[PDB]
Amino acid sequence: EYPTVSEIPVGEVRLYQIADGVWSHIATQSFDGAVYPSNGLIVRDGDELLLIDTAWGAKNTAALLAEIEKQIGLPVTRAVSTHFHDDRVGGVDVLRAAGVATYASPSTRRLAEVEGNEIPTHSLEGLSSSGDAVRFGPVELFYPGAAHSTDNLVVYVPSASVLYGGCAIYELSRTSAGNVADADLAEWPTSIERIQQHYPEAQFVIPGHGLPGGLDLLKHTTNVVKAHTNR
Ligand SMILES: C[C@H](CS)C(=O)N1CCC[C@H]1C(=O)O
Ligand code: NA
Ligand SMILES: [Zn+2]
Ligand SMILES: [Zn+2]
Ligand SMILES: [Zn+2]
């Protein structure tokens, strides 16, 4: 029942309740003539919401805010971007204009600036070394090491046993490597192993693109990465 890329027109956003107080958000964009989905997360924080990642662009992110207001009706007070690419920070200016406090690691902020992307306002401390974790409202943020990008973070919701892998974790249906231009292929498997080690109790694992599953998505990603490595 997870919404698929064929059931969301570009410009629209769907929410999917994963567990009590936890949703993913799903949006789409076209790339090179194909249509791709992208996921983020929404976590209830008392009477407010924590947003993880934009909906991939300004128009989608405006739609996200409208959909959250319509369906949930609680204010989004903070947002965290999990890496510097446009499916994570594209829409930050929209969030900021709407009064949402935007956050990312200093590593993400630097890379976004170099790329000419939107730059979250606030810097997250305590995430500079592989294996570092910090609590952020109702979630834990974890830097597993370089993988899909050098800055990628994962997010865990301990109340719900939900692990949001972002773009460091691939869905099962992805059989070959995606965008690896900014990746550290050599470190990626090691970084995945850190995630497995730190969150062995995860019940739901959400990739940055595509269908959720369980912890098997980690080994799946390792397999695809290692196949690409040996191309
Ligand atoms: C914008 C995302 C960031 S992980 C991306 O790179 N995509 C998403 C669609 C394909 C691929 C690309 O642009 O090469
Ligand atoms: Na932890
Ligand atoms: Zn990316
Ligand atoms: Zn602020
Ligand atoms: Zn992505």
Author numbering: 32 to 262
Task: Provide excerpts from the study.
β-Lactam-containing compounds remain the most important antibiotics in clinical use, but their effectiveness is threatened by increasing resistance. β-Lactam resistance is most importantly mediated by serine- and zinc-dependent metallo-β-lactamases (SBLs and MBLs, respectively), which catalyze β-lactam hydrolysis. B1 MBLs (e.g., imipenemase [IMP], Verona integron-encoded MBL [VIM], and New Delhi MBL [NDM] types) are the most clinically relevant MBLs; these MBLs catalyze hydrolysis of almost all β-lactams, including the latest generations of cephalosporins and carbapenems. Crystal structures reveal that MBLs have a characteristic αβ/βα sandwich fold, that they possess conserved zinc ion binding sites, and that loops flanking the active site are involved in ligand binding. We report systematic studies on the inhibition of four clinically relevant MBLs (IMP-1, VIM-2, SPM-1, and NDM-1) and the model MBL BcII by the four captopril stereoisomers and both enantiomers of a captopril derivative, 1-(2-mercaptobenzoyl)pyrrolidine-2-carboxylic acid (d- and l-MBP).
